[PDB]
From a paper:
The proteins MakA/B/E can form a tripartite toxin that lyses erythrocytes and is cytotoxic to cultured human cells. Here, we identify the proteins from the five [name] genes, vca0880 through vca0884, that are coexpressed from the operon makDCBAE and analyze the crystal structures of MakA, [name], and MakE. For structural analyses, MakA, [name], and MakE were crystallized in their soluble, compact forms in which the hydrophobic β-tongue is hidden in the interface between their respective head and tail domain. Each protein is predicted to undergo a conformational change in which the head domain is unfolded and rearranged into two long helices in order to assemble into a membrane-bound tripartite complex.
[name] has the same overall fold as MakA and MakE but deviates more from MakA, with an r.m.s.d of 3.0 Å calculated on 328 Cα atoms. The [name] tail domain is very similar to that of MakA; differences are mainly found in the head domain in which [name] comprises a larger β-sheet (strand order β1β3β2β4β5) than MakA. One [name] molecule is found in the asymmetric unit in which we also modeled two sulfate ions. [name] has two additional cysteines, Cys87 and Cys103, which form a disulfide bond that rigidifies the connection between the carboxyl terminus of α2 with the N terminus of α3. In [name], the program detected a stretch with increased hydrophobicity, residues 194 through 228; however, a transmembrane helix was not suggested. In [name], the hydrophobic region constitutes most of β2 and all of β3. The pore form of AhlC was used to model [name] and generated a structure in which the tip of the protein has one more hydrophobic side and one more polar side. On the other hand, because [name] is less hydrophobic, it is considered to not bind the membrane directly. Next, [name] binds to the membrane-anchored MakA and arranges itself as a scaffold for the pore-like complex. We hypothesize that the first step, the conformational shift and subsequent membrane attachment of MakA, is the most critical. Both unbound and membrane-bound MakA appear to attract [name], which would undergo a similar conformational change and interact with MakA but not directly with the membrane.
Author numbering: 0 to 354
């Protein structure tokens, strides 16, 4: 236990930070790109969904108003500590008085308390937005449930259409790249492209018309998003079975099934990126661990322990290398990601690029 965290541990946690904040931004983009058409006077349940999705849109836009500041603070926290820590580490043990060691280590103490405070405050932003999103998603679930209850005759047809839509989304998501610290460190470049699925519905069993459009981000390496989506057999298979399943249902029941599947996807991504993949709690405990070790060392040298026998000080120049490696990483993930050309998936069964 040096004055440093385990490096592999810290990088994987920073990778989670970097995928989570990317996920939040893309989720926000998904919320603000959601489009629902008309032709066919809106049923009551769709009037309700339009309003309640708008609330969810507002909740995530409010969070985005703070996300840049929150992300910047995380990056700065690691840049500031490594710089301060590197200044301590240079102290040649030969000519560095114990009073000097105490001084520079107390500057570490000051920064760590800063870092802990700003991390906890950011975590409160997450919990505020998470609870807001959950309440909004509960209103969405009620509306679509009431809509399905107005169509009990077609309930099992709607369940099948919704399931295939969830499967189709999963089949595309399963083509995404695995983002790890090892691969970011090794220079791998991840491409972030938005994939729009345009869900049509059949009118009077005769003509397909647009109903809803929904976009989400897909990460690839090397090849574009279109290259792998257009090449996946599972995707085209899911598209063909969805078309046949939509022939068993009213235009309105088709719409209610699409809407329920999209509501479920929105709810899972908020649960994912605003709570489960929220790594701020683990970030605070990292700083806390370091404060405990620095205060123990400060207490030790103040109270008369012999400095050259305290292992935290014997290894200070190795902990500095760890912090440098960590700071090199946060600067890497601070870059703008690479945006690829978007992909359109239309449920008249075609895959287009640049669209």
């Amino acid at each position: 236990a040096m004055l440093s965290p385990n490096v592999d541990t810290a990088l994987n946690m920073l990778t989670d930070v970097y995928t989570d904040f990317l996920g939040i931004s893309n989720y926000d983009a998904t919320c603000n790109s959601l489009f629902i058409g008309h032709v066919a006077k809106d049923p009551n349940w769709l009037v309700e969904v339009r309003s309640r999705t708008e609330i969810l849109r507002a909740v995530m836009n409010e969070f985005m108003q703070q996300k840049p500041k929150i992300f910047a603070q995380i990056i700065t926290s690691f840049i500031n500590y490594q710089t301060t820590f590197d200044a301590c580490a240079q102290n040649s043990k030969a000519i560095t008085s114990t009073k000097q060691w105490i001084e520079c280590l107390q500057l570490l103490q000051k920064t760590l308390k800063q870092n802990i405070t700003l991390t906890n405050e950011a975590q409160q932003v997450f919990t505020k937005s998470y609870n807001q999103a959950k309440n909004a998603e509960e209103l969405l679930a009620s509306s679509i449930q009431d809509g399905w209850n107005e169509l009990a005759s077609e309930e099992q047809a709607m369940v099948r259409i919704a399931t295939e839509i969830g499967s189709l989304s999963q089949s595309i998501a399963s083509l995404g790249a695995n983002v790890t610290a090892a691969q970011l460190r090794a220079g791998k470049a991840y491409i972030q492209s938005m994939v729009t699925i345009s869900y049509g519905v059949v009118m009077g069993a005769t003509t397909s018309v647009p109903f809803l459009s929904f976009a989400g981000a897909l990460f690839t390496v090397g090849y574009s998003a279109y290259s792998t989506i257009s090449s996946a057999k599972e995707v085209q298979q899911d598209l063909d079975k969805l078309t046949q399943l939509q022939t068993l249902a009213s235009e309105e029941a088709q719409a209610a099934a699409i809407t329920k599947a999209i509501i479920q996807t929105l709810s899972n991504m908020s649960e994912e990126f605003l709570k489960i993949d929220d790594s701020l709690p683990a970030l605070s405990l990292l700083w806390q661990d370091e404060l405990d070790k620095v205060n123990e060392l400060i207490n030790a040298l103040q109270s008369g322990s012999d400095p050259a026998l305290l292992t935290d000080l014997q290894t200070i120049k190795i902990a500095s290398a760890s912090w440098k490696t960590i700071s090199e990483f946060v600067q890497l993930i601070s870059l703008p990601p690479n945006v690829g050309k978007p992909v359109l998936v239309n449920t008249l069964n075609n895959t287009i690029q640049e669209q």
